[PDB]
């Protein structure tokens, strides 16, 4: 498995044409503020293809 390719799985809003977003902030899911921590209702935006 080659895990050197990633794709942004979670996003707050849709991406604009010809726009680049390289941030790795914690996706705010649900209603509990993540405040930077991961776990329940807080997923990582990037995911490996495998």
């Amino acid at each position: 498995g080659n895990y050197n390719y990633l794709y942004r799985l979670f996003r707050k809003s849709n991406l604009k044409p010809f726009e680049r977003d390289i941030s790795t902030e914690i996706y705010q899911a649900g209603s509990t503020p993540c405040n930077g921590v991961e776990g329940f209702n807080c997923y990582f935006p990037l995911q490996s293809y495998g």
Partner: antibody
Amino acid sequence: QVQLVQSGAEVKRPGSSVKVSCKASGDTFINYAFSWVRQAPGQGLEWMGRIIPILDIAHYAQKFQGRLTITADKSTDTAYMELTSLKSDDTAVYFCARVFRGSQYWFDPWGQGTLVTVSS
Amino acid sequence: EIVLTQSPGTLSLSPGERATLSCRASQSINNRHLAWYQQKRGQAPRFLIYGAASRATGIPDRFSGSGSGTDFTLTISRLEPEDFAVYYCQQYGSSPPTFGQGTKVEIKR
């Protein structure tokens, strides 16, 4: 469930390049970050650094910015640690933790630890 | 956020009473980001409480904590002989994670 198996103690000399391994079995290796924490005898814990396997980026501390070299093999699911110019006060128990992939995290799993004696 | 100091340090408590381990905050922990552990004699630490209020799956109900902005506690009721170890504090509200010195609970003989 996260069996973080490590290696044994290594008797080194003052000034070397140690290489401690940490077998990360159980769940996947890329969905969780890893951090190494030293434990000096009777001096609590100290966070040295952290590695992100999915991003291949490290975040060292102020006292290890340039000396510590923490890597992680994404094939054998093993995290490594390397430190250059080992001084006398480096005889601590190096633990292996599996932190989350966030800016703020806790050390939920741990390891058996390695009593790497440098001063010999 | 950088300094954690255990107030008791040592506590010779009877096997079955209640204990209180303090960890005073230094730089006004923002979102109650503190963690508790249990480092037994010659073993690895065990995660007990995250966020200073919520417990972990598998931890007995006797372990509990309280604290809002500058002082967190650890309320353990009816300490069994197995719960006699060193407990540390870890804050994750700032960028550099820091620890404390640890409080050793010994048997009251």
